[PDB]
Design a protein around this ligand. Structure first.
Ligand SMILES: [Ca+2]
Ligand SMILES: [Ca+2]
Ligand SMILES: [Ca+2]
Ligand SMILES: [Cl-]
Ligand code: NA
Ligand code: NA
Ligand code: NA
Lengths: 4, 473
């Protein structure tokens, strides 16, 4: 869902 | 007389200072006496090596938490691949200790630095909200070098808890002055991603920060959009230098890269600015960034002069941050008036998009009402539309002063048929303009395909004030  | 840091890698921090002028002018702020003392910054990432020899002296447990494991200790999870090094690299950019014979220095090398361990696990809405809302009367500045996937087909932003955290932060955080949220604008350049399709960067409550290479160019990973506010240096090609910071396992790295490195440098510069005037509001800080950022020698093909004479680019916002100018302008800054919000529903009927749609509307910007705006800050075009292939759309918005904001450029990989559901495309490019007059929305099919859809809602949302303007640049 979220990425570095 | 100010003495610059003696740290062994400080000479390699080309972006902090130099005779060359290709820097963020940070030494000028240090020489004015601003190094970050008393300011608290938190890195929302995969953890922080709190015992790192270049972070321990500035580490602040009150700025830290482990949301992934629900404990106070944000120590990274160590693995053979050193996967969880990202937050430690970001933290050193802000607040690596100075004059201690180790690595380089942070921008705000006397500030207090914490980290929220929240990326090492499933990043839910609740996880984001607990991180953004951590200790908001102690943490001053939150830095986030993460976001929705940069595949160039995603449209996503904060869900309900995270958005509630943003509003709670800017309204009640920092003693009612408002939490400062700094965001990396994105790494989706290779996918032709648009940072307006990212609700975190597109938010008015975040300072979205883009990157420039050492030689002043738009890096390969850069995303262009109208919501970006300003720029800091980061990596480029292999002849260009990179960012020097603290690395996992108590090491030093000279090869920190990408959008991830730009937001922490901005957070450090904002920390210096807050030290120069602790009474600045979250909106004050954005005003300071707009007024002091420097376009000069950043190369872009889309530089445009807006209605108040400021150069603005979709790759760079208002340009490179200038720490010396920020701290100077902050010291005698007059707090901006309370924020007004003027909601203008534009459409009287749905409109077929076809090959090209142009919607023109003359507005009074709430003339005669308490939310009358003569001095724009952010503007949003909140659009609801259907379309068969979303990435073929290009969307532009023209202000009454003639400033053309690209709300959305073509996204070749975005095949979605889901359209936009009240998506609040934001532009910073008309900041300080008078928004009374004719606004123009343009929606066009950039492909030869016989695409089809309908615009069913266009709300123009204006934020700003009715006082305090400067003579245009
Ligand atoms: Ca832990
Ligand atoms: Ca050091
Ligand atoms: Ca993106
Ligand atoms: Cl609002
Ligand atoms: Na407030
Ligand atoms: Na933003
Ligand atoms: Na006008």
């Amino acid at each position: 869902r979220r990425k570095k | 007389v100010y003495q610059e840091p003696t740290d062994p890698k400080f000479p390699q921090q080309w972006y902090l200072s130099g005779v060359t002028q290709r820097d963020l002018n940070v030494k000028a702020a240090w020489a004015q006496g601003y190094t970050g003392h008393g300011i608290v910054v938190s890195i929302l990432d995969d953890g922080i090596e709190k015992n790192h020899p270049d972070l321990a002296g500035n580490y602040d447990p009150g700025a830290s938490f482990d949301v992934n494991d629900q404990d106070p200790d944000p120590q990274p999870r160590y693995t053979q691949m050193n996967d969880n090094r990202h937050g430690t690299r970001c933290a050193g950019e802000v607040a690596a200790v100075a004059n201690n014979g180790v690595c380089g220095v942070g921008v705000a090398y006397n500030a207090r630095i914490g980290g929220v361990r929240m990326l090492d696990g499933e990043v839910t809405d609740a996880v984001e909200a607990r991180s953004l809302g951590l200790n908001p009367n102690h943490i001053h500045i939150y830095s986030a070098s993460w976001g929705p996937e940069d595949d160039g087909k995603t449209v996503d932003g904060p869900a309900r808890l995270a958005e509630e955290a943003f509003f709670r932060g800017v309204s009640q955080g920092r003693g009612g002055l408002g939490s400062i949220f700094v965001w990396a604008s994105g790494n989706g350049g290779r996918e032709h991603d648009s940072c307006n399709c990212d609700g975190y960067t597109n938010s008015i409550y975040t300072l979205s920060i883009s990157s420039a290479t050492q030689f002043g160019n738009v890096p390969w990973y850069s995303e262009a959009c109208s919501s970006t506010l300003a720029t800091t240096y980061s990596s480029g090609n292999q002849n260009e230098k990179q960012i020097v910071t603290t690395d996992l396992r108590q090491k030093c790295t000279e090869s920190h890269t990408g959008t991830s490195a730009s937001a922490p440098l901005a957070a450090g510069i904002i920390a210096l600015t807050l030290e120069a005037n602790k009474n600045l509001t979250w909106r004050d800080m954005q005003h300071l960034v707009v007024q002091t950022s420097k376009p000069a020698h950043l190369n872009a093909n889309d530089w445009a002069t807006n209605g108040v004479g400021r150069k603005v680019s979709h790759s760079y916002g208002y340009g490179l941050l200038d720490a010396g100018a920020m701290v100077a302008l902050a010291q005698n800054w007059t707090t901006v008036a309370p924020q007004r919000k003027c909601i203008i529903d534009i459409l009287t009927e749905p409109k077929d998009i076809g090959k090209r749609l142009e919607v023109r509307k003359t507005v009074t910007a709430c003339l005669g009402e308490p939310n009358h705006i003569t001095r724009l800050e952010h503007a949003q075009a909140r659009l609801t539309l259907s379309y068969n292939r979303r990435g073929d759309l290009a969307i532009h918005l023209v202000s009454p002063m003639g400033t053309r904001s690209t709300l959305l450029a073509a996204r070749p990989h975005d095949y979605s048929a889901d359209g936009f559901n009240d998506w609040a495309f934001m532009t910073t490019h008309s900041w300080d303009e008078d928004p009374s007059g004719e606004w123009v929305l343009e929606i066009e099919n950039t492909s030869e395909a016989n695409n089809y859809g309908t615009l069913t809602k266009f709300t123009l949302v204006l934020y700003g004030t009715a006082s305090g303007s400067l003579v245009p640049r």
